[PDB]
Write a protein that binds this DNA or RNA. Sequence first.
DNA 1: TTAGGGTTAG
Length: 364
Amino acid sequence: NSVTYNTLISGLGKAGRLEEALELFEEMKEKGIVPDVVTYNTLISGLGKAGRLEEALELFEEMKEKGIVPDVVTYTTLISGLGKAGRLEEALELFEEMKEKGIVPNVVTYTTLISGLGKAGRLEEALELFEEMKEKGIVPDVVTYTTLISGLGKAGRLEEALELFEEMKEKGIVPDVVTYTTLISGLGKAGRLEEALELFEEMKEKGIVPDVVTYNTLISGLGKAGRLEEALELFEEMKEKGIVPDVVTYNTLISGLGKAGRLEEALELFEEMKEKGIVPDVVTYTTLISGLGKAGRLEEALELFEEMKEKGIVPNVVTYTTLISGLGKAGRLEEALELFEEMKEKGIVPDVVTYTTLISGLGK
DNA sequence: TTAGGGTTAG
């Protein structure tokens, strides 16, 4: 029964049925049968990817207590989850713990830390870790390079991101659609959309086929350069090439339309995505709430905020800030303050944007 | 057989 139950949970986890996997896991522990490390790693990954990091860390504690020894996969998964949640110090603490326990980190472990460091803007530390990895005889692959290229591009260090891309090719590491898309994004964000479009052409000529993420990146870049009509033309064509738009495609176009004040069309796409089975998320609702509030349609923005909660979508700091900005600009400071208090009550931490927005409203 | 990279909102 131990092997059958473990294969089942590991199977369900692989199939993305986390709650069903968790159920059989509890059921196997009720019947006193011991879960294996693959089962624990699968559940820890699922929980981490669902944002349920405290539950992931609880399972990590549970396997240690039950005498199930964490391996490189266990630590790498948790380091990934902690890093994605901006909990860099804890991710690094876990990396120091695995090393003290004689568990050998590999290229995946190091790439995961490089990613978490780069996302927290600690790019120099990511560059130093990349040098450290090489000194230990760990060979970076296409994923490791792409990770750093992304960190560099996000800090607007495009000349260094392209230098690293050239170094990578010089070492015989072949770029894939992800490497090219990363650069297309970086270029597009640094006001170099034309270079990004030339690189997209050079990518295709090298036999690299774009995926939906490549298209979403081009759509984003076009919109930012005041070329929303070309973004919409690319989307209206995207379907013909067989590429299926996803939640991000819709979120990006909704943002572009909403920023241009073309709110009716943004809402048309919101209805179109729902008809096509594409499920709106926190980004979809927050983008529309911002579009509505900025166009003076504050009551609609507040009603959409109610709708979002009713659909089980959890508002974040971005959602609260856009409404605080909306309420503040309309002179509804009492409501903006209550919302600032409600957000704090839900454990949502304000950032500099939240503070400066609220001060601007109260200061008028 | 579980773990790493690219896209979107204030």
